[PDB]
Amino acid sequence: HKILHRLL
Amino acid sequence: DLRALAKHLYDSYIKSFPLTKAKARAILTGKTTDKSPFVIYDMNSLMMGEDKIKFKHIQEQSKEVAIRIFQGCQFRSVEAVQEITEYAKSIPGFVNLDLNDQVTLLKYGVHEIIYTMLASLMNKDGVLISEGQGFMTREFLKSLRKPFGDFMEPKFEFAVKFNALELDDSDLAIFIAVIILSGDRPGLLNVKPIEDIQDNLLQALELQLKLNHPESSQLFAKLLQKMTDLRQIVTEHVQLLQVIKKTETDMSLHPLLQEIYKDLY
Numbered sequence A: 001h002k003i004l005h006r007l008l
Numbered sequence B: 001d002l003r004a005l006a007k008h009l010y011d012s013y014i015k016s017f018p019l020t021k022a023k024a025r026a027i028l029t030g031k032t033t034d035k036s037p038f039v040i041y042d043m044n045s046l047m048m049g050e051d052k053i054k055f056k057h058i059q060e061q062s063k064e065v066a067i068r069i070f071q072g073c074q075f076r077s078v079e080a081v082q083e084i085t086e087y088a089k090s091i092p093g094f095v096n097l098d099l100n101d102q103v104t105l106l107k108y109g110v111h112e113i114i115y116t117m118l119a120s121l122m123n124k125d126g127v128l129i130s131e132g133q134g135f136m137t138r139e140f141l142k143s144l145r146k147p148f149g150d151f152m153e154p155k156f157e158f159a160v161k162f163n164a165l166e167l168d169d170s171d172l173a174i175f176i177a178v179i180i181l182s183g184d185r186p187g188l189l190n191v192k193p194i195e196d197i198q199d200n201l202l203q204a205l206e207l208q209l210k211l212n213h214p215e216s217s218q219l220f221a222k223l224l225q226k227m228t229d230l231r232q233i234v235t236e237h238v239q240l241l242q243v244i245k246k247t248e249t250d251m252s253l254h255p256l257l258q259e260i261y262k263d264l265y
């Protein structure tokens, strides 16, 4: 979940 | 405390989501000093509408109507995921949870919340789009060629029954938070501290509803049933998307949305 992790 | 938490959730909800339900209902009931939204019901009105938004926003774009609308949908969904993420991080306790769990909660929460907030922009006849400056009719959406003609329908059906409960933004702020903090999401590592946050959110929600919807005792109970209903709407939305994904060779799914859909249901 690359993008989600970055958002978080 | 509980009243303080409800207030804090309302304030960040207002900061995270530009187009509020209050604002949406004023547009849909003409109770606004602004210009009525441009209505979209066919090929030519869609093209006319696009002319107008060429002067408000802005690589690849299909000349097929259903695919182009679905592409526009994807970008709005991506923008909703971001908003929902900033909202979640405002919920006291959330950012202190294990990161892998935070990601899981959003992964499973995000669509449930999207259909919740979409309800605010809908009535039985259609849905507000582009920040409230357009309106797409339900019937026009039902007419789209398969499998896109049935994409919005269950979302309208949900919203018609949900909007009957007359929640306002302050109710919705807490309702959303309860959904995000669900301890029964698959693959959660530490269920306990999530349930501990949901417990207080549930209490704030119960109080908020008693105070502001005094005539509807048991609104809390009815709300709780919706949260579970949403789970099956998403499940069935996800099945629709795997169909589109496989058989619509033209379009490409957006990477963030793929992330969320992957290994989901």
Ligand SMILES: COc1ccc(Br)cc1/C=C1\SC(=O)N(Cc2ccc(C)cc2)C1=O
Binding pocket: B066, B069, B070, B072, B073, B074, B076, B077, B080, B114, B115, B117, B118, B121, B127, B129, B136, B141, B148, B151, B152
């Ligand atoms: C006009 O809308 C459409 C017509 C036909 C087709 Br096929 C797909 C779409 C659009 C959708 S469905 C969805 O989940 N979202 C994202 C969203 C997230 C949050 C808020 C508040 C509003 C919208 C859309 O944009």
